[PDB]
Amino acid sequence: GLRRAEQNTEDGMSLIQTAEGYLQETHEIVQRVRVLAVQAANGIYSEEDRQQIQVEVSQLVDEIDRIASQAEFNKMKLLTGAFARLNPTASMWFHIGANMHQRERVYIETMNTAALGLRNPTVLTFISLSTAGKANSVIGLCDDALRVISKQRADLGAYYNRMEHAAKG
Amino acid sequence: VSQLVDEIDRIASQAEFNKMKLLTGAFARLNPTASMWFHIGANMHQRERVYIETMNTAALGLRNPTVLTFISLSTAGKANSVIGLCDDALRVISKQRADLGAYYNRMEHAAKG
């Protein structure tokens, strides 16, 4: 039992490590937006120029959603909110022991454009940079967008260190 | 920290040998539910007592035994005071590790003798 249970812990660490793998690319693309919003925040650009800045933002916000949709671990989507706490459709439990009541729950929250605040869950319109005034307000939003991604990676790293200790013991 | 404190409580309840829990405080000295004796002789009264103390997060002082609230590391003000509890935590761990070795050596020579 203990030998097989310790094999389950490595299977669990495969889930958490793979789950954190996509969050780095999500972190990269948002940081690409954060500097771009600073570029359009100044008044030297016209509306024609800011349109071409928005063309890039069209793909970047789009590419964030495709990360959450196609993120899988053993044919199971993770970041789409299916394993969240408040409104879950399934619960992620890891059995890491040789007895019956020894299993822990791992929460993976929502990491789509709607969850981070870059999209409206009801209106379904995302942030745009085609205006100098709008771009000044996208810098603030992308900052809190990074905070949620950093917060989620903190928890995934937190569980992984705990799972590492449990396997050793 | 919440992950680390959770594991310690998980270890204490799940530390089991031959369907007997050990680190949950079952075999403590002050108020034990069971007393462990080992038969190291061929006669009637050759028995020596064994003590395994409580090693849950409540006993270590990480969490309050009543309110079940553990240490706070979200503020630098109480982060400094967290270190002092860690010194007390490992010392209690260190004391029991020597006790397990001390009982082990007492048994080891008895097997030799």
Binding site: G117 | N64, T66, V67
Partner: protein, 257 residues
């Protein structure tokens, strides 16, 4: 009327019919006098939880935790008063610059702050243990006595005050609500003042984390209810203070036209 001066939940000790019942019961148990007996079935022994002696005992334990928890706060004030008294009495022979005073005075505050916050958690444990002694009494006849009403109010009163200093505002909501359901405690403004802050605290947490609007309104509603209720019990109705609060709530809440 002092309920605590009684020193007991109820003084437990007549009829010849009852007296004859007592004599025959005591002799039945005296023949079965087995002081070392311990029943394998707990159900019959659990009936002792309904006795007056059991309730007369759990009252003492909660009171002892309450009285000991009082001394923790009381001794803390004496220490701080003596501490700042000694600071100004001892001579400062190495003090000739203005910014020497600012740092030294600021050092005392951190010393005092550690003393108070250490006292609160030390006192809070006594208050939390007092609650568990009162909630385990299973005699509804003895739960309505004046002594129980006074202590349960005093334990809750000190528990909420101590918990407030530790910034554990959301944990005071269940205790505060149970406090306003006893005697005339609903007629006191301090009890409704904390509820205004505690529900405001929970209101911000849902607002800060961007939660559902449903929980926001529930905490917003209960905030305005006890904000206006506390205003009524201190300055009186139709007071100048009361009128201003209504205007504040007027913009805060939702109205329909």
């Amino acid at each position: 009327v002092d309920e605590l001066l009684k020193g007991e939940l109820v003084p437990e000790n007549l009829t010849e019919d009852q007296k004859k019942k007592k004599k025959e019961i005591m002799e039945q148990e005296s023949l079965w006098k087995n002081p070392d007996f311990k029943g394998y079935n707990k159900t019959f022994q659990e009936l002792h939880q309904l006795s007056k002696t059991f309730a007369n005992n759990q009252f003492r334990l909660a009171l002892s935790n309450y009285q000991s928890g009082v001394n923790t706060i009381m001794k803390n004030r004496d220490w701080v008063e003596q501490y700042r008294k000694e600071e100004a009495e001892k001579k400062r022979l190495d003090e000739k610059w203005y910014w020497q005073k600012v740092d030294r005075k600021a050092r005392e505050e951190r010393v005092v702050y550690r003393e108070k916050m250490k006292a609160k958690q030390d006192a809070l444990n006594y208050f939390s243990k007092a609650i568990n002694h009162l909630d385990e009494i299973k005699n509804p006849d003895l739960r309505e006595r004046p002594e129980f009403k006074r202590l349960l109010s005093d334990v809750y009163r000190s528990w909420i005050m101590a918990e407030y200093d530790l910034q554990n505002l959301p944990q005071t909501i269940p205790i505060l609500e149970l406090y306003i359901e006893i005697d005339d405690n609903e007629k006191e403004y301090p009890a409704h003042k904390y509820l205004a802050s505690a529900y405001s605290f929970e209101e911000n947490m849902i607002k800060k984390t961007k939660g559902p609007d449903d929980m926001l309104f529930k905490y917003r509603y209960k905030k305005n209810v006890h904000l206006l209720r506390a205003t009524e019990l201190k300055y009186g109705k139709d007071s100048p203070e009361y009128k201003h609060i209504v205007n504040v709530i007027n913009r805060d809440e939702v109205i329909s036209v």
